Write a protein that holds these residues in place. Structure first.
Motif, PDB file in Angstrom:
ATOM      1  N   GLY A 192       0.781  -1.206   0.000  1.00 51.24           N
ATOM      2  CA  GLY A 192       0.000   0.000   0.000  1.00 51.24           C
ATOM      3  C   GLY A 192       0.820   1.267   0.000  1.00 51.24           C
ATOM      4  O   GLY A 192       1.873   1.360  -0.655  1.00 51.24           O
ATOM      5  N   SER A 193       0.239   2.271   0.693  1.00 55.28           N
ATOM      6  CA  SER A 193       0.734   3.653   0.567  1.00 55.28           C
ATOM      7  C   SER A 193       0.830   4.343   1.921  1.00 55.28           C
ATOM      8  O   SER A 193       0.262   3.893   2.897  1.00 55.28           O
ATOM      9  CB  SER A 193      -0.185   4.457  -0.345  1.00 55.28           C
ATOM     10  N   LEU A 194       1.450   5.529   1.904  1.00 55.42           N
ATOM     11  CA  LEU A 194       1.244   6.466   3.020  1.00 55.42           C
ATOM     12  C   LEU A 194      -0.231   6.839   3.045  1.00 55.42           C
ATOM     13  O   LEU A 194      -0.863   6.969   1.980  1.00 55.42           O
ATOM     14  CB  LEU A 194       2.055   7.733   2.803  1.00 55.42           C
ATOM     15  N   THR A 195      -0.749   7.050   4.264  1.00 54.34           N
ATOM     16  CA  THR A 195      -2.157   7.437   4.400  1.00 54.34           C
ATOM     17  C   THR A 195      -2.348   8.947   4.523  1.00 54.34           C
ATOM     18  O   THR A 195      -3.477   9.399   4.627  1.00 54.34           O
ATOM     19  CB  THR A 195      -2.854   6.709   5.552  1.00 54.34           C
ATOM     20  N   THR A 196      -1.248   9.706   4.494  1.00 52.32           N
ATOM     21  CA  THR A 196      -1.292  11.168   4.425  1.00 52.32           C
ATOM     22  C   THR A 196      -0.503  11.610   3.204  1.00 52.32           C
ATOM     23  O   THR A 196       0.419  10.895   2.766  1.00 52.32           O
ATOM     24  CB  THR A 196      -0.758  11.806   5.712  1.00 52.32           C
ATOM     25  N   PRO A 197      -0.838  12.785   2.616  1.00 51.95           N
ATOM     26  CA  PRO A 197      -0.041  13.351   1.539  1.00 51.95           C
ATOM     27  C   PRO A 197       1.452  13.291   1.876  1.00 51.95           C
ATOM     28  O   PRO A 197       1.851  13.644   2.992  1.00 51.95           O
ATOM     29  CB  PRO A 197      -0.598  14.774   1.457  1.00 51.95           C
ATOM     30  N   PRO A 198       2.276  12.786   0.938  1.00 53.64           N
ATOM     31  CA  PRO A 198       2.015  12.670  -0.495  1.00 53.64           C
ATOM     32  C   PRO A 198       1.411  11.332  -0.951  1.00 53.64           C
ATOM     33  O   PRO A 198       1.273  11.122  -2.134  1.00 53.64           O
ATOM     34  CB  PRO A 198       3.385  12.902  -1.131  1.00 53.64           C
ATOM     35  N   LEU A 199       0.970  10.462  -0.027  1.00 53.56           N
ATOM     36  CA  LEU A 199       0.215   9.229  -0.360  1.00 53.56           C
ATOM     37  C   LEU A 199       1.060   8.304  -1.247  1.00 53.56           C
ATOM     38  O   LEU A 199       0.546   7.495  -1.995  1.00 53.56           O
ATOM     39  CB  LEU A 199      -1.096   9.607  -1.049  1.00 53.56           C
ATOM     40  N   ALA A 200       2.389   8.396  -1.084  1.00 49.33           N
ATOM     41  CA  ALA A 200       3.324   7.629  -1.903  1.00 49.33           C
ATOM     42  C   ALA A 200       3.099   6.132  -1.743  1.00 49.33           C
ATOM     43  O   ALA A 200       2.849   5.661  -0.631  1.00 49.33           O
ATOM     44  CB  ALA A 200       4.719   7.992  -1.489  1.00 49.33           C
ATOM     45  N   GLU A 201       3.221   5.392  -2.843  1.00 50.73           N
ATOM     46  CA  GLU A 201       2.928   3.974  -2.883  1.00 50.73           C
ATOM     47  C   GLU A 201       4.203   3.190  -2.589  1.00 50.73           C
ATOM     48  O   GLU A 201       4.703   2.459  -3.434  1.00 50.73           O
ATOM     49  CB  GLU A 201       2.233   3.673  -4.221  1.00 50.73           C
ATOM     50  N   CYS A 202       4.682   3.329  -1.351  1.00 46.98           N
ATOM     51  CA  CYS A 202       5.991   2.884  -0.969  1.00 46.98           C
ATOM     52  C   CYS A 202       5.951   1.967   0.251  1.00 46.98           C
ATOM     53  O   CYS A 202       6.997   1.661   0.803  1.00 46.98           O
ATOM     54  CB  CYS A 202       6.884   4.090  -0.693  1.00 46.98           C
ATOM     55  N   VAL A 203       4.737   1.570   0.707  1.00 50.17           N
ATOM     56  CA  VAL A 203       4.614   0.914   1.981  1.00 50.17           C
ATOM     57  C   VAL A 203       4.249  -0.570   1.885  1.00 50.17           C
ATOM     58  O   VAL A 203       3.264  -0.928   1.249  1.00 50.17           O
ATOM     59  CB  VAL A 203       3.608   1.630   2.890  1.00 50.17           C
ATOM     60  N   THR A 204       4.989  -1.422   2.619  1.00 47.52           N
ATOM     61  CA  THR A 204       4.526  -2.758   2.958  1.00 47.52           C
ATOM     62  C   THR A 204       3.791  -2.605   4.292  1.00 47.52           C
ATOM     63  O   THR A 204       4.416  -2.317   5.298  1.00 47.52           O
ATOM     64  CB  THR A 204       5.632  -3.830   3.065  1.00 47.52           C
TER      65      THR A 204
END
Ligand SMILES: CC(=O)NCCCCOc1ccc(NC(=O)Nc2ccc(S(N)(=O)=O)cc2)cc1
Ligand SMILES: [Zn+2]
Length: 257
Positions: A192-204
């Motif tokens: 998935g992503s960060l849940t706050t801006p910038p909402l980058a799609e960098c997260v496991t």
């Protein structure tokens, strides 16, 4: 500019951050019956004994405890992860009342709050580089329900009066984040992503199945924080959660049967 209000909240974020409508946004609803048990998933390794907390900050969206991430002290490994992720910070999302506040949901159930322990992949050297990579961050998400107090949260609760408004920070040394963890490390995971801006799609994402219990008095103290800076109208920092986003072509895997 962005926030959680009617005119700047989650439904507006896509204008400044078009990835808000991307293929791997967070949070999501965890449908427990559709999550697949994956026997290849390893136990999560949480090594927080040498964690060095630095500061606590009201950043206008949450409060955030920052750690010294300049060496492998407090690290997350194993689970669905390849390699070593350094603990950077933790923060929370919470509600105006106990029936909302979490970002992830479990069979549509909302918890009163959700703790995010944020880690970045050492193979990218720094967090700014890591947020540009699909496997750059690992966030350990822990649900909070209201009941008995969590002793390990009290040191946090007792300094919030000192960071009431946006831009305030304080020394916050010798905080042991092991005191925030539930008994079980059973988890769900998905990309998935960060849940706050910038909402980058960098997260496991690694979301624990077992919530921690916190007292009403502990969560009431979260809700006394302010979104605003001291020179702006008082607006209580509550309901700082993004709702569940479309799962799209993703599979949520369970570490447990
Ligand atoms: C050596 C030293 O003194 N180090 C100290 C830290 C310096 C860098 O500080 C920092 C601190 C924080 C950041 N960005 C974030 O964490 N973004 C983020 C946004 C949303 C989520 S979530 N969980 O999806 O809601 C998780 C992470 C970058 C640098
Ligand atoms: Zn968060």
């Amino acid at each position: 500019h962005w926030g959680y209000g009617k005119h700047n909240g989650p439904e507006h974020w896509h204008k400044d951050f078009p990835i808000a409508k991307g293929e791997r946004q967070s949070p999501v609803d965890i449908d427990t019956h559709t999550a697949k048990y994956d026997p290849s998933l390893k136990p999560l390794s949480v090594s927080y004994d040498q964690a060095t907390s630095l500061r606590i900050l009201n950043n206008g969206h949450s409060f955030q405890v920052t750690f010294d991430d300049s060496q492998d002290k407090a690290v997350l490994k194993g689970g669905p992860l390849d390699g070593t992720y350094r603990l950077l910070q933790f923060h929370f999302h919470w509600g105006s009342l106990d029936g909302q506040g979490s970002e992830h949901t479990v069979d549509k159930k909302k918890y009163a709050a959700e703790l995010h322990l944020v880690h970045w992949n050492t193979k990218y050297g720094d967090v700014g580089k890591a947020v540009q990579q699909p496997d750059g961050l690992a966030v350990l998400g822990i649900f909070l329900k209201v009941g008995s107090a969590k002793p390990g949260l009290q040191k946090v609760v007792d300094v919030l009066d000192s960071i009431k408004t946006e831009g305030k920070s304080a020394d916050f040394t010798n905080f042991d984040p092991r005191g925030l963890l539930p008994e079980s490390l059973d988890y769900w995971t998905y990309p998935g992503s960060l849940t706050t801006p910038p909402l980058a799609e960098c997260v496991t994402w690694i979301v624990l199945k077992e919530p921690i219990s916190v007292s009403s008095e502990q969560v009431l103290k979260f809700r006394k924080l302010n979104f605003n800076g001291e020179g702006e109208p008082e607006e209580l920092m509550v309901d700082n959660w993004r709702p569940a986003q479309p799962l799209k072509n993703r599979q949520i895997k369970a570490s447990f049967k």
